[PDB]
Motif scaffolding. Structure first.
Motif, mmCIF file in Angstrom:
data_model
loop_
_atom_site.group_PDB
_atom_site.id
_atom_site.type_symbol
_atom_site.label_atom_id
_atom_site.label_comp_id
_atom_site.label_asym_id
_atom_site.label_seq_id
_atom_site.Cartn_x
_atom_site.Cartn_y
_atom_site.Cartn_z
ATOM 1 N N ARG A 126 0.866 -1.203 0.000
ATOM 2 C CA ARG A 126 0.000 0.000 0.000
ATOM 3 C C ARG A 126 0.900 1.250 0.000
ATOM 4 O O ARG A 126 0.546 2.197 -0.683
ATOM 5 N N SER A 127 2.025 1.254 0.730
ATOM 6 C CA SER A 127 2.940 2.422 0.883
ATOM 7 C C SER A 127 3.666 2.719 -0.435
ATOM 8 O O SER A 127 4.313 1.837 -1.005
ATOM 9 N N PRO A 128 3.517 3.955 -0.987
ATOM 10 C CA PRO A 128 4.079 4.280 -2.300
ATOM 11 C C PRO A 128 5.578 3.991 -2.419
ATOM 12 O O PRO A 128 6.019 3.571 -3.477
ATOM 13 N N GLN A 129 6.320 4.231 -1.335
ATOM 14 C CA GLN A 129 7.779 3.971 -1.199
ATOM 15 C C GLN A 129 8.098 2.526 -1.615
ATOM 16 O O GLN A 129 9.148 2.325 -2.231
ATOM 17 N N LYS A 130 7.214 1.567 -1.311
ATOM 18 C CA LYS A 130 7.449 0.110 -1.500
ATOM 19 C C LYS A 130 7.128 -0.305 -2.934
ATOM 20 O O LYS A 130 7.856 -1.191 -3.437
ATOM 21 N N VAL A 131 6.100 0.278 -3.556
ATOM 22 C CA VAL A 131 5.656 -0.151 -4.915
ATOM 23 C C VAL A 131 6.789 0.105 -5.921
ATOM 24 O O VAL A 131 7.483 1.114 -5.811
ATOM 25 N N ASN A 160 -4.809 -7.231 7.618
ATOM 26 C CA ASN A 160 -5.750 -6.717 8.650
ATOM 27 C C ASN A 160 -6.431 -7.887 9.384
ATOM 28 O O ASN A 160 -6.109 -9.065 9.070
ATOM 29 N N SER A 161 -7.352 -7.580 10.312
ATOM 30 C CA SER A 161 -7.838 -8.520 11.356
ATOM 31 C C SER A 161 -9.319 -8.852 11.162
ATOM 32 O O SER A 161 -9.686 -10.025 11.308
ATOM 33 N N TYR A 162 -10.157 -7.846 10.919
ATOM 34 C CA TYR A 162 -11.638 -7.944 11.018
ATOM 35 C C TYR A 162 -12.220 -8.064 9.603
ATOM 36 O O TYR A 162 -11.734 -7.390 8.699
ATOM 37 N N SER A 175 -5.890 -12.879 9.336
ATOM 38 C CA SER A 175 -7.055 -12.157 9.901
ATOM 39 C C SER A 175 -7.624 -12.940 11.101
ATOM 40 O O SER A 175 -8.117 -14.041 10.893
ATOM 41 N N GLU A 176 -7.591 -12.360 12.307
ATOM 42 C CA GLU A 176 -7.952 -13.068 13.563
ATOM 43 C C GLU A 176 -9.431 -13.465 13.495
ATOM 44 O O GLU A 176 -9.785 -14.548 13.965
ATOM 45 N N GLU A 177 -10.288 -12.608 12.942
ATOM 46 C CA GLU A 177 -11.737 -12.914 12.863
ATOM 47 C C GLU A 177 -11.964 -14.082 11.892
ATOM 48 O O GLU A 177 -12.892 -14.882 12.129
ATOM 49 N N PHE A 202 4.953 -7.237 16.590
ATOM 50 C CA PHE A 202 4.089 -7.114 15.383
ATOM 51 C C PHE A 202 4.139 -5.674 14.865
ATOM 52 O O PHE A 202 4.864 -4.832 15.444
ATOM 53 N N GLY A 203 3.405 -5.409 13.780
ATOM 54 C CA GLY A 203 3.527 -4.155 13.025
ATOM 55 C C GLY A 203 2.497 -3.112 13.422
ATOM 56 O O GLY A 203 1.635 -3.344 14.279
ATOM 57 N N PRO A 204 2.561 -1.922 12.772
ATOM 58 C CA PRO A 204 1.672 -0.802 13.088
ATOM 59 C C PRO A 204 0.168 -1.078 13.002
ATOM 60 O O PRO A 204 -0.598 -0.449 13.767
HETATM 61 N N1 LIG Z 1 -3.690 -14.661 13.559
HETATM 62 C C1 LIG Z 1 -2.567 -14.262 14.182
HETATM 63 O O1 LIG Z 1 -1.996 -14.955 15.024
HETATM 64 C C2 LIG Z 1 -1.901 -12.945 13.849
HETATM 65 C C3 LIG Z 1 -0.606 -12.694 14.301
HETATM 66 C C4 LIG Z 1 0.042 -11.510 13.962
HETATM 67 C C5 LIG Z 1 -0.650 -10.628 13.169
HETATM 68 N N2 LIG Z 1 -1.901 -10.885 12.744
HETATM 69 C C6 LIG Z 1 -2.630 -9.883 11.948
HETATM 70 O O2 LIG Z 1 -2.008 -9.754 10.671
HETATM 71 C C7 LIG Z 1 -2.199 -8.361 10.258
HETATM 72 C C8 LIG Z 1 -0.855 -7.813 9.868
HETATM 73 O O3 LIG Z 1 0.081 -7.725 10.949
HETATM 74 P P1 LIG Z 1 1.596 -7.227 10.839
HETATM 75 O O4 LIG Z 1 2.270 -7.409 12.164
HETATM 76 O O5 LIG Z 1 2.281 -7.777 9.637
HETATM 77 O O6 LIG Z 1 1.114 -5.662 10.575
HETATM 78 P P2 LIG Z 1 1.921 -4.560 9.660
HETATM 79 O O7 LIG Z 1 3.363 -4.683 9.822
HETATM 80 O O8 LIG Z 1 1.132 -3.243 9.920
HETATM 81 O O9 LIG Z 1 1.595 -5.068 8.142
HETATM 82 C C9 LIG Z 1 0.340 -4.824 7.492
HETATM 83 C C10 LIG Z 1 0.595 -4.737 5.994
HETATM 84 O O10 LIG Z 1 -0.620 -4.568 5.269
HETATM 85 C C11 LIG Z 1 -0.306 -3.646 4.175
HETATM 86 N N3 LIG Z 1 -1.596 -3.151 3.697
HETATM 87 C C12 LIG Z 1 -2.541 -2.449 4.353
HETATM 88 N N4 LIG Z 1 -3.594 -2.299 3.541
HETATM 89 C C13 LIG Z 1 -3.336 -2.986 2.402
HETATM 90 C C14 LIG Z 1 -4.019 -3.287 1.119
HETATM 91 N N5 LIG Z 1 -5.235 -2.821 0.867
HETATM 92 N N6 LIG Z 1 -3.381 -4.026 0.213
HETATM 93 C C15 LIG Z 1 -2.149 -4.542 0.406
HETATM 94 N N7 LIG Z 1 -1.448 -4.327 1.542
HETATM 95 C C16 LIG Z 1 -2.010 -3.542 2.505
HETATM 96 C C17 LIG Z 1 0.675 -2.641 4.693
HETATM 97 O O11 LIG Z 1 1.368 -2.118 3.538
HETATM 98 P P3 LIG Z 1 2.642 -1.162 3.663
HETATM 99 O O12 LIG Z 1 3.783 -1.964 4.220
HETATM 100 O O13 LIG Z 1 3.030 -0.860 2.217
HETATM 101 O O14 LIG Z 1 2.022 -0.043 4.505
HETATM 102 C C18 LIG Z 1 1.523 -3.572 5.555
HETATM 103 O O15 LIG Z 1 2.526 -4.205 4.724
HETATM 104 C C19 LIG Z 1 -2.815 -7.572 11.378
HETATM 105 O O16 LIG Z 1 -4.203 -7.357 11.196
HETATM 106 C C20 LIG Z 1 -2.572 -8.470 12.598
HETATM 107 O O17 LIG Z 1 -3.547 -8.187 13.611
HETATM 108 C C21 LIG Z 1 -2.532 -12.003 13.049
#
Ligand SMILES: NC(=O)c1ccc[n+]([C@@H]2O[C@H](COP(=O)([O-])OP(=O)(O)OC[C@H]3O[C@@H](n4cnc5c(N)ncnc54)[C@H](OP(=O)(O)O)[C@@H]3O)[C@@H](O)[C@H]2O)c1
Ligand SMILES: NC(=O)c1ccc[n+]([C@@H]2O[C@H](COP(=O)([O-])OP(=O)(O)OC[C@H]3O[C@@H](n4cnc5c(N)ncnc54)[C@H](OP(=O)(O)O)[C@@H]3O)[C@@H](O)[C@H]2O)c1
Lengths: 338, 335
Positions: free
Chosen positions: A38-43, A82-84, A106-108, A172-174
């Protein structure tokens, strides 16, 4: 061997979790043919460069999911965004429309039928029409669902199943850190948590899975959440922010399901920024005949989030089309090669 | 009430508990087999102190009970090693009767008793019967460990440590654990050419086979467990002096060609006050993993696992079917 597997994968999101997952996919011999951010820097960047592997992959990160799927037609989309379902339906629609199998963190999506029944029915119908499997997995798959159901299998009579879990925001991430209300004021937290459209708790989906797997009937569902508070000055590496004493650093949920048949399920989960010395926990008690205990010590939540989604990929490709939940998949198994 | 019709084969420490659990699940007990003349002719309900009679007279003739009742399942708690267990398993397989058994070697007998395994598998297949070894090990040493392994990216070592109490079980097991013997008697016994396979060897054979790996090397060692103070064994009703053997500890190890190493240390001994059972497993690799079950109820879950397995064993293909090949063990309030 680098690309020893037939499997062609698109890494959907390139954040904290998919960065780890990508390296494990390459270790299993999976062919990464596409990557969505999603982040323009990465594309436009090469995925290998973006992940700091000394080798380029010959995969240019795209911001257009539908275009990547139309161009590459992978066997599997590996989703960590994302989660939900309210959010995740956007990415899952694109996968299912294109007949692309999807495994997601996605946790849900662990067990979405009760919390998001309309979106679940929609996605299941679409995925079935195109031959695709959609599966929510991650940390919970073994440690909160399948290993707990297995432990329940050693009981003669169950009165109560009780779980207690802790994980660290800064593993984990933002996306997750922001959803955990890290750095918000208590007043901001209280307005959010009381909000009409607050998402379902991770633990609610856990208990829906255990109840459904056991074949029991919901009598009563209750839930409560409190903020986790900084006791002293801290830092969140996930958000790169300083946290002052009294700042919100996450939250703790408690979910409870009573069944008509007698067993009660209860799960308390804290997701927060850790200070020095804190460690993850997974502690489960069964009260009944007999009383049972399970602990995983300082459980590696971050690593096993990623290993479980990866080790599920052959299961999800081989599974029937539709939403297939992890309680219905064959036993998770160790596989060096894909 | 359940369609399942069961014969309780042996009425010792474990089948006494099992019988009550079968009744709680709605299983129909249609027969009971014992060895002791004292027990033959008694009503099983009286013999177990259920406080209702069951209308089932204990017999000493297994073949006669099976021919007369044609049960869905024989529930066996008699002995451990195929060298002994083949006698009861032959009678079940000859009569086309499905059998679930606590025999520890039957957990995975193919490598330790290949001839007796092939014989029983062929016989059971010819009559449509399933034979399955289960008990405590099913979940806590095999299936839960294979599941935990499923969360690893790379495995270097799988290491288990287990403790159980002789006095939770009956004389068959207490005698086989060499309780009350001298160290010199133990050393002659443990060095013997026909010493049975260790329980842990069958555990590691199952984990290696379930993982689909190739044996490179198998090692084993046993040492006696020694009374450090005066104790009593409730299982044998004997006083034990400081220096007496009170059980033993085995260590089994299997190295695979592919890299992963399996190791399992198991102690079965008379406990003094304050001692508790243990189930502690470590996986060294990426990542490192840990599992503990606190003061694990070995005695109760021996019996719950055999009972909860009965539907799986009835439904399974004929032959020796090992618990690593069965569907996930599940909680069922009624059968
Ligand atoms: N089930 C589990 O045990 C578990 C464990 C850990 C995490 N998770 C879930 O997994 C999700 C990600 O976690 P994370 O730690 O990797 O978070 P993160 O570092 O914030 O990564 C989320 C990624 O999604 C990208 N993004 C957001 N909207 C997008 C879209 N429409 N299309 C493509 N990419 C998109 C962001 O892109 P950019 O990098 O370019 O901004 C980022 O790379 C969260 O919802 C978290 O709650 C679940
Ligand atoms: N897999 C596991 O987790 C596990 C757990 C516990 C026990 N076990 C095993 O299960 C076995 C029984 O244990 P237990 O504690 O219940 O021992 P136990 O109290 O000694 O019971 C053994 C029974 O076998 C009976 N018996 C002996 N030969 C027989 C025959 N030919 N036909 C019918 N019955 C016969 C004895 O009958 P009489 O009373 O009439 O002499 C006795 O009732 C032992 O081998 C033990 O190692 C396995």
């Amino acid at each position: 061997h680098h690309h020893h597997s037939d499997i062609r994968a698109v890494v959907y999101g390139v954040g904290a979790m998919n960065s780890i997952v990508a390296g494990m996919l390459l270790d299993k011999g999976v062919q990464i043919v596409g990557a969505i951010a999603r982040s323009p820097q990465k594309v436009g960047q090469d995925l290998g460069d973006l992940l700091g592997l000394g080798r380029q992959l010959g995969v240019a990160v795209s911001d257009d999911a539908a275009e990547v799927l139309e161009q590459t037609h992978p066997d599997i989309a590996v989703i960590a965004v994302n989660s939900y379902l309210t959010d995740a339906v956007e990415q899952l629609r694109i996968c299912a429309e294109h007949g692309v199998n999807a495994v997601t963190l996605s946790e849900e999506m662990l067990y979405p039928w009760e919390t998001s029944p309309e979106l679940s029915a929609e996605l299941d119908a679409l995925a079935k029409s195109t031959g695709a499997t959609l599966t929510g997995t991650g940390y919970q798959d073994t440690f909160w669902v399948n290993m707990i159901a297995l432990l329940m299998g050693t009981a003669h009579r169950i009165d109560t199943v009780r779980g207690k879990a802790s994980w660290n925001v800064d593993d984990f991430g933002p996306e997750l850190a922001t959803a955990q209300q890290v750095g918000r004021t208590v007043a901001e937290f209280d307005e959010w948590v009381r909000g009409a459209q607050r998402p379902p708790t991770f633990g609610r989906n856990v208990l829906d899975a255990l109840v459904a797997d056991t074949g029991l009937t919901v009598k009563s569902i209750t839930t409560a959440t409190r903020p986790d508070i900084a006791s002293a000055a801290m830092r969140s590496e996930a958000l790169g922010i300083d946290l002052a004493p009294g700042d919100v650093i996450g939250f703790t949920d408690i979910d409870r399901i009573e069944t008509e048949e007698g067993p009660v399920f209860e799960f308390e989960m804290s997701g927060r920024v850790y200070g020095p010395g804190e460690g993850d926990i997974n502690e489960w008690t069964i009260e009944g005949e007999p009383n049972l205990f399970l602990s995983n010590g300082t459980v590696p939540t971050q690593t096993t989030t990623c290993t479980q989604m990866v080790n599920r990929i052959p299961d999800v490709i081989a599974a029937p089309p539709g939403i297939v939940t992890v309680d219905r998949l064959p036993r998770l198994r160790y596989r060096p090669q894909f």
